[PDB]
């Protein structure tokens, strides 16, 4: 337990130093732009290619169960609720932890094994300010944007599928979206996306900085990054879902 606790302490100290560098030292705009564009180019097509079939499946299941129930006109409410509070943040979790966090960990491990971190450190530069802060900010920004895009594309695809395939009424879909989804739902979705992006960036950067070299250290570090990201983001999602349903729209 002592070794995992020490690793957790190192991660927490690194994140605290990252926050201090963000709020005290000047910000790196060029590196932030580069990392934002890199994350977008690595995790934009996969997030849509995962969101579209998943939302189509959810819409199909909801429509058939409700049609057998009898209340097929209230499918829009469940569609909007699921797409806003769960589907968006969860697809963000999957396609961010799998792609962006792993890419960040691989890049920082490559810098570490090539002694570029040591090259920065011997020059008096703190690599945290120059590297970690733009990557964490880029991760948060891209997570926010991707969550918004995922929710929008999921809702539109669900509408088109339900109307043109399962022959439900379009007016019932669009007029019931706001029945169970409101400002608290979109606000908690935004909070989820921001926290997920920040945690994924922090975990990826911390694992990349502490790579073990060797011949499998980078791959092991990336796998551990992915596992830790999945576990932590699922736990945070559970906590934030409880918090959000406490401030429910219907209650």
């Amino acid at each position: 337990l002592e070794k995992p606790l020490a690793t957790v302490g190192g991660f927490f100290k690194m994140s605290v130093m990252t926050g201090k560098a963000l709020f005290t030292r000047p910000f790196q705009w060029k590196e932030f732009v580069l990392q934002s564009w890199f994350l977008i180019r690595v995790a934009f097509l996969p997030t849509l290619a995962v969101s579209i079939p998943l939302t189509v499946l959810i819409i199909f299941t909801l429509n058939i169960l409700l049609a057998e129930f009898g209340a097929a006109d209230v499918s829009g409410a469940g569609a909007a609720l699921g797409a806003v509070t769960q589907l968006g943040p969860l697809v963000t979790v999957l396609v961010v932890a799998g792609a962006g966090s792993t890419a960040i960990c691989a890049d920082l491990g490559a810098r570490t094994v090539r002694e570029e971190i040591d090259a920065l450190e011997v020059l008096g530069i703190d690599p945290i300010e120059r590297l970690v802060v733009p990557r964490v900010v880029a991760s948060t920004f891209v997570a926010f944007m991707l969550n918004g895009a995922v929710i929008t594309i999921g809702l539109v695809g669900g509408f088109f599928f339900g109307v043109y395939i399962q022959n439900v009424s379009a007016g019932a879909y669009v007029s019931t979206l706001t029945l169970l989804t409101g400002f608290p739902e979109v606000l908690i979705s935004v909070v989820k996306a921001t926290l997920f992006g920040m945690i994924a960036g922090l975990v990826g950067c911390y694992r990349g900085l502490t790579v073990a070299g060797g011949s499998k250290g980078v791959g092991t570090a990336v796998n551990e990054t992915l596992v830790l990201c999945v576990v932590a983001l699922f736990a945070v999602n559970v906590v934030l879902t409880t918090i959000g349903v406490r401030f429910g729209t219907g209650r």
Binding site: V163, Y164, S169, A170, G171, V174, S175, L177, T178
Partner: protein, 66 residues
């Protein structure tokens, strides 16, 4: 922007009454009972049309029905 009445009140593509040859009528209702746009127009309880716009003119609602 100015006339944005909500996602529920925007015309939607597809469905009966949206293809070429569909006829457009104006129905001057005493009241709409909170009816939204894109609702179903039924003849003999058969959905064969759509209501497009529910603009209120001189404080008497008029419905555009295709």
């Amino acid at each position: 922007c100015g006339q944005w009445r909500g996602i529920a009140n925007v015309p939607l593509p597809g469905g009966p009454g949206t293809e070429s040859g569909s006829m457009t009528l104006y129905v001057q209702m005493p009241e709409t009972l909170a009816l939204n746009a894109n609702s179903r127009v039924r003849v003999r309880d058969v959905f064969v049309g759509r209501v497009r716009k529910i603009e209120l003119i001189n404080w008497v609602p008029t419905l555009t029905v295709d």
